[PDB]
Design a protein around this ligand. Structure first.
Ligand code: NAD
Ligand code: MG
Ligand code: NA
Length: 250
């Protein structure tokens, strides 16, 4: 990582912590502890690079959350061996399809996708100044679906939309979410987006001071629409989802 990148990671996490605290009354750590019922004892976490930067970002992130983390010198299997040999209690590693946390002490394993969906949906659901239990979920994929599922389990009135009609069909029958028509816009104060696309939240769906909790990249909404409605944005590239994985595994 360049000097700029390191500054950016800490800046984004601090900014994310403030935004989450403003919205929910708790920081990311607080959200995680309440979500999972776990507490951190500064567990030793071995981050192993996989050949199928990212790991350097993970190191900065895990240190920020108080973990005793290190990155192995070797990648892949040699790295895994090195991590276990050096007393890693939790292993953190990713290929192109899967990013996992594996707690070797208790056997618990986390997948980044549902962990990210759940925490971003949790943050959204815990908006203190919410005037209803209506929540809009945009994107019902590997991150969105678990997020919507969590909101349903918390007895929220969950509206969902996905541009993939088959996935929308699946979610509407298996989860019991209300299919949302973007052409029939109702106003929401709680929005959860999990899409790799921009401009996915129509203006007409927005109300003033609404919370948009989104792990999606690029941003679901433009800066101009964000400013016009004073949207309380919760958006961070990696750390929040990583914290969710670690706490879910403790
Ligand atoms: N910030 C983080 O920590 C973090 C962690 C994991 C993933 N992500 C990001 O979250 C995003 C979603 O991840 P994923 O694994 O669920 O992807 P995915 O492909 O499994 O799901 C994305 C879904 O969004 C839907 N979609 C696309 N455009 C849409 C539109 N205009 N309206 C409604 N739905 C639309 C697609 O049909 C798809 O089902 C990705 O950008 C990913 O990189 C972020
Ligand atoms: Mg994140
Ligand atoms: Na997006």
């Amino acid at each position: 990582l360049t000097p700029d990148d390191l500054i950016n990671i800490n800046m984004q996490l601090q900014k994310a912590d403030s935004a989450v605290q403003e919205v929910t009354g708790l920081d990311i750590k607080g959200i995680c502890k309440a979500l999972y019922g776990t507490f951190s004892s500064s567990e030793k976490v071995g981050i192993v690079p996989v050949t199928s930067n990212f790991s350097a970002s993970l190191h900065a992130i895990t240190q920020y959350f108080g973990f005793d983390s290190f990155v192995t010198d070797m990648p892949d299997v040699s790295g895994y061996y090195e991590a276990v040999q050096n007393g890693a209690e939790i292993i953190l590693m990713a290929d192109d399809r899967t990013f996992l946390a594996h707690n070797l002490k208790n056997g618990k394993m986390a997948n980044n996708q549902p962990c990210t969906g759940i925490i971003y949906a949790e943050i959204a659901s815990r908006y203190l100044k919410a005037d209803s239990k209506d929540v809009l979920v945009v994107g019902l994929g590997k991150v969105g679906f678990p997020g919507a599922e969590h909101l349903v389990q918390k007895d929220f009135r969950v509206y969902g939309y996905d541009a993939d009609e088959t996935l929308l069909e699946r979610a509407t029958s298996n989860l019991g979410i209300i299919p949302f028509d973007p052409a029939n816009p109702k106003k929401f104060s709680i929005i959860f987006e999990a899409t790799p696309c921009a401009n996915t939240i129509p203006e007409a769906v927005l109300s003033e001071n609404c919370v948009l909790s989104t792990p999606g990249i690029p941003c679901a909404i433009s800066e101009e629409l964000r400013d016009k409605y004073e949207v309380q944005l919760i958006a961070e590239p990696l750390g929040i989802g990583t914290a969710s994985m670690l706490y879910s595994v403790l």
